[PDB]
Amino acid sequence: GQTNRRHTAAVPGPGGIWSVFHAGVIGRGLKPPKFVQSRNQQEVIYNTQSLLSLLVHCCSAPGGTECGECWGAPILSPEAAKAVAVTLVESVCPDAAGAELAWPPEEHARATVERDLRIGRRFREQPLLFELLKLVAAAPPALCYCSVLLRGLLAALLGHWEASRHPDTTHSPWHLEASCTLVAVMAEGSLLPPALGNMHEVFSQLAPFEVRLLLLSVWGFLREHGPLPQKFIFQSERGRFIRDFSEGGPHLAVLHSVLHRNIDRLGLFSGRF
Amino acid sequence: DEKVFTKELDQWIEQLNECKQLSESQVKSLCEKAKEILTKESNVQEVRCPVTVCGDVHGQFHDLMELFRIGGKSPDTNYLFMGDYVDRGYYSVETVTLLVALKVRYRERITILRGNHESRQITQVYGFYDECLRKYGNANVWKYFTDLFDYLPLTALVDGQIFCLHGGLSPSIDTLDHIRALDRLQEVPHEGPMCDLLWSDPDDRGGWGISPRGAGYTFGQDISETFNHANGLTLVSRAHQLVMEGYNWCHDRNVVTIFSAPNYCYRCGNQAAIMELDDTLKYSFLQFDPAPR
Amino acid sequence: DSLYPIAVLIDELRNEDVQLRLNSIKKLSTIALALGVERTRSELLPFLTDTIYDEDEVLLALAEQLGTFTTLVGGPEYVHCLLPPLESLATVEETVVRDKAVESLRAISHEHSPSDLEAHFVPLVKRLAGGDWFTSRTSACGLFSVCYPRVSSAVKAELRQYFRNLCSDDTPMVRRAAASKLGEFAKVLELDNVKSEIIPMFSNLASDEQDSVRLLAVEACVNIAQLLPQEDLEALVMPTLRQAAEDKSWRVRYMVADKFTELQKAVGPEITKTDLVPAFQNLMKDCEAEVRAAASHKVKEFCENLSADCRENVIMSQILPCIKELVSDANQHVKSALASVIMGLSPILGKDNTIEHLLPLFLAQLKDECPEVRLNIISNLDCVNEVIGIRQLSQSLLPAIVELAEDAKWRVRLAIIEYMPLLAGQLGVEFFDEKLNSLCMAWLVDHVYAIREAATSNLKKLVEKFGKEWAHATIIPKVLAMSGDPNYLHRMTTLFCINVLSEVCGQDITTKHMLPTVLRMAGDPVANVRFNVAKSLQKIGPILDNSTLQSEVKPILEKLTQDQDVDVKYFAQEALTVLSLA
Amino acid sequence: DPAPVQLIVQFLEQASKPSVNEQNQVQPPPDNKRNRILKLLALKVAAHLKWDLDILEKSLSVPVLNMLLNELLCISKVPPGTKHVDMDLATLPPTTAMAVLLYNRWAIRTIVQSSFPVKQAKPGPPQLSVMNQMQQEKELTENILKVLKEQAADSILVLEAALKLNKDLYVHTMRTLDLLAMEPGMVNGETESSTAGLKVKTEEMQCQVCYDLGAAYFQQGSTNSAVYENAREKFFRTKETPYSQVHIC
Ligand SMILES: [Mn+2]
Ligand SMILES: [Mn+2]
């Protein structure tokens, strides 16, 4: 998704002996178009489905040898997903001032706020980007290259949660949805333990400052255990890249404290992990 | 519940319109209601034409009543104040009290922004804290007013083209999306985007430069043109400098300084002006002089 | 613990903030009433005598607190122990604390017994008037009039001679305080005491080489002139004021020009007839505009207290040339003062004297170059309406209303609009439809709101004075035709006009002529016009019958109550609940 | 200043709890400059004002870590207890047992609170007040770190106090046991990041507190709420009929 006749028939200030009442116009005023995107709701997600199916047919290496016994699932080629992530980064934010894979500290996010805000605006104007991330999160080593988008989105979400006065998260639906989607994408891309998978699940009824602190712990964990092309050794069984975590002590402690401070509403979510 | 509170608000407004301040509990309740009301407003308040934008009042209740007599009554026509109505004035608490009462009573008929004097370190060195200590005896009304000033919006967007704000442009800000993503619930610092948004000044410099005030930068014509072209704007309204005619155009009719405080500090003896914008975005500069007391 | 108050007072008073200091000053009373009378009379007062602070707010606090110890020390029998603290706090460097101290001493000097007064308070001022600093002498001179009638004649003479000695100083830093105290001190002095020793002192103070002393010498002069009878003015105080009013400085001249009504009312009319005429004339022909403006401001009420034996003569012979020469002055302040002050002498001169010379100067000050004089000459035109015929004042203002009706300022326009209804009814109807209709139609579309509401009220007055069916085809159509502009201001103006004319034009015309406009102006997308239309319907509710309110007003009100705005919705709900229509 | 206690006991309209806080602050500030007869005249009044309410929750808003610490230290002046709290099951006066249980509950509450994500107040200036607040926060952190290393015996003391019932009052002993069980459950619920095999005791204490609140909790109020039931459900889910969402897990 996304001249003078009329001015003469009502002139002379209705007096024919004095000047006009006003003193001129500034610009034009009363913008004619004022159009809003209301094309359709249905039959729009199916175009995205067809595009994702085409992309899957393109990246999946051949393919068609009846792997396994009866549930052969073709893996995604790392080169194709890497190229997709590269062109996505080039289309979203062509900047390269902070395109390093090493995650900078938290205070460093206070200088590139404009880039993070423009990335958030690009993500909110076109949701297909998120779907594209779902294609990059399939291959393990592919999401390690599309780190600038994740960093910018996380910084924008942190800046939004820092300036949120509503005591409930449901007041900002798109921001909560984007937070959960981003955490799920960066967790299923072999980068975060399932504790983060439970964190983006419990995000549904958490306080704004609690969500901000949890995302800050996510930033700290990604700064410590940075997504890098190494530590993704190949396996002799299949083409999947398995990441062996050599996890976060203080991060799990912060998560446990956040869960314990809201036992009156997140009691059933504790037994899951 | 609502009718009795509305009648109490009308009584408070009628009492304030006769040079009569309220009590401690009344001011406390008014500040609380203004806090719950202004919480829903964003940093860039989307104001719709027609309106009547004003400038600085600097705590001048008589000049405020003169402005109301000139530019129509408050409930009738819309108003857009751009800060500086709390310092450098004999009657400063009455002006801000009347403004906040009109805001909580006519939330959709009047908008007020935050200025450089709406803080905690400026009101203590310009007389507002002294006035609150002398009139109300204690120093609780001043605390309530300074706690409420943090909820005032920063800028305003009239008809999606006019950009009204107290200070002016910022070097760390390139679009309105950065202004909308700022935490205005914070004391005005000595450096940053909000400090520049509340302390900037226009000039023929070109680019940037340190301001002689001590905070904020000083932009030129090229910067104003770049800011107006990159945001779809056609004008930037401001009220931070002392003028004589009341309104001043700068940067090839791109910045409009509107000082609506006649006889500033009772020593200059200048005029004041407001800008009435009609439905078709036609501007009219209504000027006036300090009313005799 | 008896040492607990001392231990908590020696440290809490020494801090960095002043709020705790003010709280401690407020709680000194509670501490004193809790410690007992003997404990505050034994060592608390000598302990608080020698507390020299650094700031000034605690000084004012203790000064205003010491004045509230009347029934907490022991009463008038124990007021001799609170003297050391006051005499220690009186000799300081600041000034306002000294004024607070002298006010407290003057307030607490009433409950003092006469014996205790003459026994203790006299040595206080005797030792205080002989200090080295000027603060002591300025604080001593203000404690003599309150204790004068209670002491004997010997103490009276002693204090009088000591005052005469102390007012013989060389620098005016204490003579100013002495002169300020002469004003309130001469209230209790007899005739012989002011004739013997006060006259020489006043003559020596009037001949001072400083200008700041005359500022208060003239006040002392007017005070002694008002206090003394008639038989002791024409030979004692006249030469002093005559030689002071013609000094080289303009300050004393300005002061005697200000304080002149009391002189002319105390000395009587004859004394003003003998020699006050030149003294008043020399204050109107000076180079400074301040003295001239003061004389102009004061002459109005100076003429009020003048007898009717030589009033018109001195007005037509002496006051008229000065008025004519001050009107044509180039300075704007004196012109504005004259325009604001001369409109009060019309009932004094009479009817047959306004057309003689008042009308020329009035027309000259009306059509002037600066607006400051016009704002004053147009704001005082109602007091000349009763002493001058309506026809005369309406005919005299014809060559000026063609320009003053539309100019830069709006105060003159406001006054013209307010004064018009007294003229449109006298100049007939042809003059109205000739120029006044265009004038009012132009006023109704002015920029400011005050002129608009003034023209609205004036149109209401005109439609109440002339008639109903007369304005049905001359004013109503032109007003209704204005409700088609893209500007909301003109629409609000037309709504206000419909509101103000609905109560005068009956109910038959406001049913099918002015009502359909208000009904059709409900679909206005401007949110600032819908609430005005709702208020207009509420106002015209009781005027119209119930049939019209139930036929079309109720459905349109139900439709208006279902919008998205809150202000218009609340206004419509209030209109529904006040008219009992729902 | 002297009649403030009687005025607060007669009517809690003006200076309900701020007067005792100000008195304790003044006594703490004066205690540094060799307080001879200044701190002794205010600590007793503060203890009396604290015992007039006889609560711990309502006495936690303003006295966060230091003021309540000084209040407890002044109230514990009866029993020295230089060594660790032990042998509490013997014949002891009731006020000493009350002081020990209140101190244990306060220590548990501060230990639990020192690990919360509660949002802090933003600051954008620097002055003497900021330095004072920073010093107070540093002192509070130091006190919490000092009390955390000695909290190993607090659980044993709470268990010993909840096991004994020689306070000559059945209802008071039951209320003290329920409070100790709730504090132990809250302390064990925050110790999941240290080691496993510890949720069993927390679930047992939660079930005991729930049964106590069901039968007879106490005579006063503000002692139990839905938080206890939520913690019990969380402990039951972590330990592992079943619910629709719980059956899948
Ligand atoms: Mn200003
Ligand atoms: Mn300013």
From Swiss-Prot, chain A:
Instruction: Give the location in the cell.
Output: Nucleus; Cytoplasm; Nucleus membrane
Span-the-membrane segments of this chain are 128-148, 202-222
Main role?
A: Component of the integrator complex, a multiprotein complex that terminates RNA polymerase II (Pol II) transcription in the promoter-proximal region of genes.
Instruction: Provide the family line.
Output: Belongs to the Integrator subunit 5 family.
UniProt subunit comment? Component of the Integrator complex, composed of core subunits INTS1, INTS2, INTS3, INTS4, INTS5, INTS6, INTS7, INTS8, INTS9/RC74, INTS10, INTS11/CPSF3L, INTS12, INTS13, INTS14 and INTS15. The core complex associates with protein phosphatase 2A subunits PPP2CA and PPP2R1A, to form the Integrator-PP2A (INTAC) complex.
Protein name (Swiss-Prot/TrEMBL) = Integrator complex subunit 5
State the organism named in the record: Homo sapiens
Gene of origin?
INTS5
Curated annotation (Swiss-Prot), chain B:
Class of enzymatic activity (EC top level) = hydrolase
Task: Name the catalytic site residues.
Answer: 117 (proton donor)
Required co-factors: Mn(2+); Fe(3+); Zn(2+)
* Catalysed conversion reaction: O-phospho-L-seryl-[protein] + H2O = L-seryl-[protein] + phosphate; O-phospho-L-threonyl-[protein] + H2O = L-threonyl-[protein] + phosphate
- GO MF, any single term: protein heterodimerization activity
**Record annotation: effect of changing residue 84 to N:** Loss of phosphatase activity
Q: Locate the residues binding Mn(2+) 1.
A: 56, 58, 84
What name is this protein filed under? Serine/threonine-protein phosphatase 2A catalytic subunit alpha isoform
Instruction: Tell me the gene name.
Output: PPP2CA
Q: Where does Mn(2+) 2 bind?
A: 84, 116, 166, 240
PTM summary from the entry reads: Carboxyl methylation influences the affinity of the catalytic subunit for the different regulatory subunits, thereby modulating the PP2A holoenzyme's substrate specificity, enzyme activity and cellular localization.
InterPro entries assigned to the protein according to its UniProt record, in alphabetical order: Calcineurin-like_PHP_ApaH, Metallo-depent_PP-like, PPA2-like, Ser/Thr-sp_prot-phosphatase
From Swiss-Prot, chain C:
Q: Which residues carry this modification: N6-acetyllysine?
A: 273
Gene Ontology molecular functions: protein antigen binding; protein heterodimerization activity; protein phosphatase regulator activity; protein serine/threonine phosphatase activity
Instruction: Kindly name one Pfam family recorded for this protein.
Output: HEAT
Q: What is this protein called in UniProt?
A: Serine/threonine-protein phosphatase 2A 65 kDa regulatory subunit A alpha isoform
The alphabetical list of record keywords is: Acetylation, Cell membrane, Cell projection, Centromere, Chromosome, Chromosome partition, Cytoplasm, Disease variant, Host-virus interaction, Intellectual disability, Membrane, Nucleus, Repeat
Q: Where is this region: PP2A subunit B binding?
A: 1-392
- Region (Polyoma small and medium T antigens Binding) spans which residues? 40-314
Swiss-Prot record, chain D:
TPR repeat locations:
207-240
Highest taxon of the source?
Eukaryota
| Name of the protein in its database record | Integrator complex subunit 8
Q: Print the domain comment field.
A: The WFEF motif is required for the recruitment of protein phosphatase 2A (PP2A) to transcription pause-release checkpoint.
**Function in brief:** Component of the integrator complex, a multiprotein complex that terminates RNA polymerase II (Pol II) transcription in the promoter-proximal region of genes.
Q: What taxonomic lineage is listed for the species of origin?
A: Eukaryota, Metazoa, Chordata, Craniata, Vertebrata
Linked pathology is: Neurodevelopmental disorder with cerebellar hypoplasia and spasticity: An autosomal recessive neurodevelopmental disorder characterized by global developmental delay, profound intellectual disability, seizures, absent speech, spasticity, facial and limb dysmorphism, and subtle structural brain abnormalities including cerebellar hypoplasia.
Q: Where in the cell is it found?
A: Nucleus; Chromosome
What protein family is recorded? Belongs to the Integrator subunit 8 family.
Organism of this sequence:
Homo sapiens (Human)
Assembly: Component of the Integrator complex, composed of core subunits INTS1, INTS2, INTS3, INTS4, INTS5, INTS6, INTS7, INTS8, INTS9/RC74, INTS10, INTS11/CPSF3L, INTS12, INTS13, INTS14 and INTS15. The core complex associates with protein phosphatase 2A subunits PPP2CA and PPP2R1A, to form the Integrator-PP2A (INTAC) complex.
